[PDB]
Protein backbone atom coordinates (compact mmCIF):
# COMPACT_ATOMS: atom_id res chain seq x y z
CA UNK A 1 0.00 0.00 0.00
CA UNK A 2 2.38 2.70 -1.32
CA UNK A 3 2.23 6.46 -0.80
CA UNK A 4 1.53 8.09 -4.22
CA UNK A 5 4.40 10.56 -4.44
CA UNK A 6 4.74 10.23 -8.19
CA UNK A 7 1.52 12.20 -8.47
CA UNK A 8 3.33 14.93 -6.59
CA UNK A 9 6.90 14.77 -7.90
CA UNK A 10 6.28 13.13 -11.28
CA UNK A 11 3.25 15.35 -12.02
CA UNK A 12 2.76 17.18 -15.31
CA UNK A 13 1.45 20.63 -14.43
CA UNK A 14 2.64 22.41 -11.28
CA UNK A 15 0.92 25.29 -9.57
CA UNK A 16 2.05 28.87 -9.56
CA UNK A 17 3.49 29.52 -6.11
CA UNK A 18 0.83 32.04 -5.11
CA UNK A 19 -1.76 29.26 -5.73
CA UNK A 20 0.43 26.40 -4.47
CA UNK A 21 -0.97 22.87 -4.63
CA UNK A 22 -1.49 20.70 -1.51
CA UNK A 23 -1.81 16.90 -1.51
CA UNK A 24 -2.76 14.94 1.61
CA UNK A 25 -0.99 11.66 2.22
CA UNK A 26 -2.38 9.07 4.57
CA UNK A 27 -2.56 5.30 4.96
CA UNK A 28 0.47 4.07 3.05
CA UNK A 29 4.19 3.29 3.26
CA UNK A 30 6.86 5.34 1.51
CA UNK A 31 10.36 4.43 0.42
CA UNK A 32 11.95 7.79 1.10
CA UNK A 33 15.40 6.51 0.17
CA UNK A 34 13.98 6.40 -3.37
CA UNK A 35 13.51 10.16 -3.13
CA UNK A 36 16.82 10.91 -1.41
CA UNK A 37 18.70 8.50 -3.68
CA UNK A 38 16.98 9.32 -6.95
CA UNK A 39 19.36 12.27 -6.38
CA UNK A 40 17.70 14.56 -8.96
CA UNK A 41 17.36 17.41 -6.45
CA UNK A 42 19.21 20.71 -6.29
CA UNK A 43 17.80 20.98 -2.74
CA UNK A 44 16.76 18.55 0.00
CA UNK A 45 16.59 20.57 3.25
CA UNK A 46 14.83 18.74 6.13
CA UNK A 47 13.90 20.15 9.54
CA UNK A 48 13.07 18.63 12.91
CA UNK A 49 13.91 15.28 11.26
CA UNK A 50 16.91 13.45 9.56
CA UNK A 51 16.43 12.55 5.86
CA UNK A 52 17.99 9.14 6.54
CA UNK A 53 15.83 8.02 9.48
CA UNK A 54 12.74 8.92 7.44
CA UNK A 55 12.27 5.25 6.59
CA UNK A 56 12.35 4.48 10.33
CA UNK A 57 9.66 6.95 11.39
CA UNK A 58 5.87 7.16 11.10
CA UNK A 59 3.52 10.14 11.16
CA UNK A 60 -0.18 10.88 11.69
CA UNK A 61 -0.50 12.83 8.43
CA UNK A 62 1.60 13.96 5.51
CA UNK A 63 0.91 16.92 3.25
CA UNK A 64 2.87 17.46 0.01
CA UNK A 65 2.87 21.11 -1.08
CA UNK A 66 4.17 21.80 -4.59
CA UNK A 67 4.70 24.80 -6.93
CA UNK A 68 7.22 26.55 -9.21
CA UNK A 69 9.63 29.37 -8.33
CA UNK A 70 12.83 30.70 -9.85
CA UNK A 71 16.04 29.42 -8.33
CA UNK A 72 17.02 32.50 -6.32
CA UNK A 73 13.83 32.26 -4.26
CA UNK A 74 14.33 28.63 -3.28
CA UNK A 75 16.33 29.89 -0.27
CA UNK A 76 13.06 31.36 1.06
CA UNK A 77 11.24 28.00 1.24
CA UNK A 78 12.77 27.39 4.65
CA UNK A 79 11.56 28.36 8.14
CA UNK A 80 12.25 31.85 9.35
CA UNK A 81 12.86 33.35 5.89
CA UNK A 82 11.63 36.75 4.73
CA UNK A 83 11.35 37.84 1.15
CA UNK A 84 8.85 38.30 -1.65
CA UNK A 85 7.95 34.60 -1.80
CA UNK A 86 7.90 33.80 1.93
CA UNK A 87 6.02 37.06 2.61
CA UNK A 88 3.33 37.10 -0.11
CA UNK A 89 3.18 33.63 -1.75
CA UNK A 90 4.18 30.71 0.53
CA UNK A 91 5.20 30.98 4.21
CA UNK A 92 6.77 28.25 6.39
CA UNK A 93 6.34 28.40 10.21
CA UNK A 94 9.20 28.78 12.66
CA UNK A 95 8.43 25.39 14.17
CA UNK A 96 8.38 23.71 10.75
CA UNK A 97 8.76 19.92 10.66
CA UNK A 98 9.35 18.30 7.30
CA UNK A 99 11.55 18.46 4.24
CA UNK A 100 11.88 20.84 1.33
CA UNK A 101 12.89 19.55 -2.10
CA UNK A 102 13.56 21.45 -5.31
CA UNK A 103 14.85 20.62 -8.76
CA UNK A 104 15.66 22.73 -11.82
CA UNK A 105 12.87 22.51 -14.39
CA UNK A 106 14.39 24.70 -17.10
CA UNK A 107 13.65 21.99 -19.67
CA UNK A 108 9.98 21.85 -18.68
CA UNK A 109 8.78 25.31 -17.66
CA UNK A 110 10.89 27.65 -19.85
CA UNK A 111 9.72 28.69 -23.28
CA UNK A 112 11.33 30.59 -26.13
CA UNK A 113 9.69 33.99 -25.96
CA UNK A 114 8.96 33.66 -22.26
CA UNK A 115 6.73 31.24 -20.38
CA UNK A 116 3.95 33.20 -18.68
CA UNK A 117 1.90 30.34 -17.20
CA UNK A 118 3.67 30.95 -13.88
CA UNK A 119 2.68 33.92 -11.70
CA UNK A 120 3.77 35.22 -8.29
CA UNK A 121 2.19 37.80 -6.01
CA UNK A 122 4.30 41.01 -5.75
CA UNK A 123 1.91 43.12 -3.69
CA UNK A 124 0.07 42.25 -0.51
CA UNK A 125 -1.10 44.53 2.26
CA UNK A 126 0.67 42.29 4.88
CA UNK A 127 2.75 39.16 5.25
CA UNK A 128 1.31 35.69 4.86
CA UNK A 129 0.62 33.58 7.90
CA UNK A 130 2.12 30.06 7.73
CA UNK A 131 0.39 27.83 5.17
CA UNK A 132 -1.94 30.73 4.33
CA UNK A 133 -2.86 30.67 0.63
CA UNK A 134 -4.01 33.99 -0.85
CA UNK A 135 -5.36 33.43 -4.36
CA UNK A 136 -7.06 36.82 -4.38
CA UNK A 137 -6.84 39.03 -7.49
CA UNK A 138 -7.91 42.40 -6.18
CA UNK A 139 -6.20 45.51 -7.54
CA UNK A 140 -3.57 46.70 -5.10
CA UNK A 141 -3.92 50.26 -3.81
CA UNK A 142 -0.38 51.57 -3.22
CA UNK A 143 -1.13 55.28 -2.83
CA UNK A 144 -3.87 57.54 -1.55
CA UNK A 145 -5.98 57.33 -4.67
CA UNK A 146 -8.86 54.86 -4.95
CA UNK A 147 -8.46 52.18 -7.58
CA UNK A 148 -12.17 51.51 -8.16
CA UNK A 149 -11.19 47.99 -9.22
CA UNK A 150 -9.07 48.99 -12.23
CA UNK A 151 -5.31 49.30 -12.72
CA UNK A 152 -3.77 52.71 -12.92
CA UNK A 153 -1.65 54.98 -10.78
CA UNK A 154 -0.52 53.19 -7.59
CA UNK A 155 -3.21 50.65 -8.51
CA UNK A 156 -1.40 47.50 -9.62
CA UNK A 157 -2.51 43.98 -10.50
CA UNK A 158 -0.90 42.06 -7.62
CA UNK A 159 0.20 39.07 -9.70
CA UNK A 160 3.25 39.41 -11.91
CA UNK A 161 4.34 36.56 -14.15
CA UNK A 162 7.71 34.94 -14.36
CA UNK A 163 9.15 35.23 -17.77
CA UNK A 164 10.72 31.82 -17.86
CA UNK A 165 13.01 31.54 -20.86
CA UNK A 166 15.59 28.78 -21.38
CA UNK A 167 18.25 31.47 -21.97
CA UNK A 168 17.86 32.75 -18.47
CA UNK A 169 20.68 32.53 -15.99
CA UNK A 170 20.46 29.68 -13.54
CA UNK A 171 19.00 31.95 -10.86
CA UNK A 172 16.12 33.07 -13.10
CA UNK A 173 15.26 29.59 -14.36
CA UNK A 174 12.21 27.81 -12.94
CA UNK A 175 12.48 25.37 -10.08
CA UNK A 176 9.79 22.89 -9.06
CA UNK A 177 9.47 22.72 -5.26
CA UNK A 178 7.96 19.97 -3.14
CA UNK A 179 7.59 20.67 0.57
CA UNK A 180 6.57 17.60 2.60
CA UNK A 181 5.02 18.16 6.00
CA UNK A 182 5.41 15.42 8.59
CA UNK A 183 2.46 15.86 10.89
CA UNK A 184 3.20 14.18 14.21
CA UNK A 185 0.17 14.87 16.34
CA UNK A 186 -1.86 12.79 18.79
CA UNK A 187 -3.14 10.11 16.37
CA UNK A 188 -2.38 6.46 15.37
CA UNK A 189 0.19 7.59 12.76
CA UNK A 190 -0.79 6.21 9.35
CA UNK A 191 2.21 7.12 7.16
CA UNK A 192 5.39 5.07 7.72
CA UNK A 193 8.75 4.76 6.04
CA UNK A 194 10.09 1.56 4.57
CA UNK A 195 11.11 0.23 8.06
CA UNK A 196 8.31 -0.43 10.65
CA UNK B 1 5.95 60.70 -0.49
CA UNK B 2 7.18 57.87 -2.72
CA UNK B 3 3.84 57.92 -4.65
CA UNK B 4 5.42 59.08 -7.91
CA UNK B 5 8.65 57.08 -7.69
CA UNK B 6 6.89 53.74 -7.28
CA UNK B 7 4.72 54.21 -10.35
CA UNK B 8 7.80 55.04 -12.42
CA UNK B 9 9.71 52.05 -11.04
CA UNK B 10 6.77 49.78 -11.73
CA UNK B 11 6.58 51.18 -15.28
CA UNK B 12 10.25 50.34 -15.83
CA UNK B 13 9.94 46.62 -15.19
CA UNK B 14 6.66 46.48 -17.12
CA UNK B 15 8.43 48.14 -20.07
CA UNK B 16 11.53 45.97 -19.74
CA UNK B 17 9.37 42.81 -19.90
CA UNK B 18 7.69 44.16 -23.05
CA UNK B 19 11.15 44.67 -24.53
CA UNK B 20 12.14 41.10 -23.61
CA UNK B 21 14.65 41.68 -20.80
CA UNK B 22 13.03 39.23 -18.41
CA UNK B 23 15.83 38.80 -15.90
CA UNK B 24 15.97 42.57 -15.64
CA UNK B 25 12.19 42.82 -15.25
CA UNK B 26 12.46 40.26 -12.46
CA UNK B 27 15.34 42.06 -10.77
CA UNK B 28 13.16 45.17 -10.59
CA UNK B 29 10.22 43.22 -9.21
CA UNK B 30 12.60 42.13 -6.46
CA UNK B 31 13.54 45.74 -5.86
CA UNK B 32 9.94 46.96 -5.77
CA UNK B 33 9.27 44.37 -3.05
CA UNK B 34 12.29 45.56 -1.11
CA UNK B 35 11.38 49.24 -1.79
CA UNK B 36 7.87 48.85 -0.33
CA UNK B 37 9.09 47.00 2.74
CA UNK B 38 11.69 49.72 3.53
CA UNK B 39 9.77 51.93 6.00
C1 LIG C 1 9.36 9.30 -10.78
O1 LIG C 1 9.85 8.55 -11.92
C2 LIG C 1 11.25 8.20 -11.85
C3 LIG C 1 11.58 7.46 -13.13
O2 LIG C 1 10.66 7.77 -14.16
C4 LIG C 1 11.52 7.37 -10.59
O3 LIG C 1 12.92 7.10 -10.50
C5 LIG C 1 11.04 8.11 -9.36
O4 LIG C 1 11.22 7.30 -8.20
C6 LIG C 1 9.56 8.49 -9.50
N1 LIG C 1 9.10 9.23 -8.34
C7 LIG C 1 8.58 8.64 -7.27
C8 LIG C 1 8.16 9.55 -6.16
O5 LIG C 1 8.45 7.42 -7.19
Numbering used by the authors:
A (entry chain B): 334 to 529
B (entry chain A): 1 to 39
Tell me what the authors wrote about this structure, in their words.
The spike protein of the SARS-CoV-2 binds to human angiotensin-converting enzyme 2 (ACE2) through the receptor-binding domain (RBD) and changes the conformation to fuse the viral and cell membranes, mediating viral entry. Here, we used a structure-guided strategy to engineer an inhibitor peptide with mutation-tolerant and potent binding ability against all SARS-CoV-2 variants. We named the peptide CeSPIACE (COVID-19 eliminative Short-Peptide Inhibiting ACE2 binding). For engineering, we determined approximately 2 Å-resolution crystal structures of CeSPIACE or its intermediate-stage peptides complexed with the RBDs of several strains, including WT, Alpha, Delta, BA.2, BA.5, or XBB.1.5.
We identified a 39-mer peptide region that was easily chemically synthesized and modified it to improve structural stability and mutation tolerance. The high-resolution structures identified the roles of the peptide residues and provided information on which residues to modify and how to modify them. The binding surface composing of G22 and L26 contributed to binding to both tyrosine and asparagine, whereas the previous A22 and M26 reduced the binding ability to Y501. Y501 binds more tightly on G22 and L26 than N501, which contributes to the nondissociation properties of the Alpha strain.
